[PDB]
Amino acid sequence: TKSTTTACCDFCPCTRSIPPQCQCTDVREKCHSACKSCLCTRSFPPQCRCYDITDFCYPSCS
């Protein structure tokens, strides 16, 4: 008992628009606990990916 796999990211790039929109371009196992766009590749292995739109970035995942 301490913590768990919360809403994370790894690579968190953003647009330089007004306002700026930040996203995740992470690719791993399943997507995190704050994804509105989540989608996977059909490849082998099929890896799942989060493409959320937030104003900000989340801490590093595992």
From Swiss-Prot:
Could you list this entry's UniProt keywords, alphabetically sorted.
Disulfide bond, Protease inhibitor, Serine protease inhibitor
Q: Where is this site: Reactive bond for trypsin?
A: 16-17, 42-43
One annotated Gene Ontology cellular component of this protein: extracellular region
Q: Does the keyword Membrane apply?
A: no
Asked if the record carries the keyword Iron, the reply is: no
PROSITE patterns listed in its UniProt record: BOWMAN_BIRK
Q: Which InterPro entries match?
A: Bowman-Birk_prot_inh, Prot_inh_BBI
Instruction: Report a single Gene Ontology molecular function.
Output: serine-type endopeptidase inhibitor activity
- SS bonds (residue pairs): 8-61, 9-24, 12-57, 14-22, 31-38, 35-50, 40-48
Q: Assembly and partners? A: Forms a monomer at protein concentrations of below 1 mM. At concentrations of above 2 mM, self-associates.
Record's function text: Inhibits trypsin but not chymotrypsin. Inhibits the trypsin-like proteinase activity present in larvae of the crop pests Adoxophyes orana, Hyphantria cunea, Lobesia botrana and Ostrinia nubilalis.
Q: Which family does it belong to?
A: Belongs to the Bowman-Birk serine protease inhibitor family.
**What name goes with this protein?**
Bowman-Birk type proteinase inhibitor
Q: What is the lineage of its organism?
A: Eukaryota, Viridiplantae, Streptophyta, Embryophyta, Tracheophyta
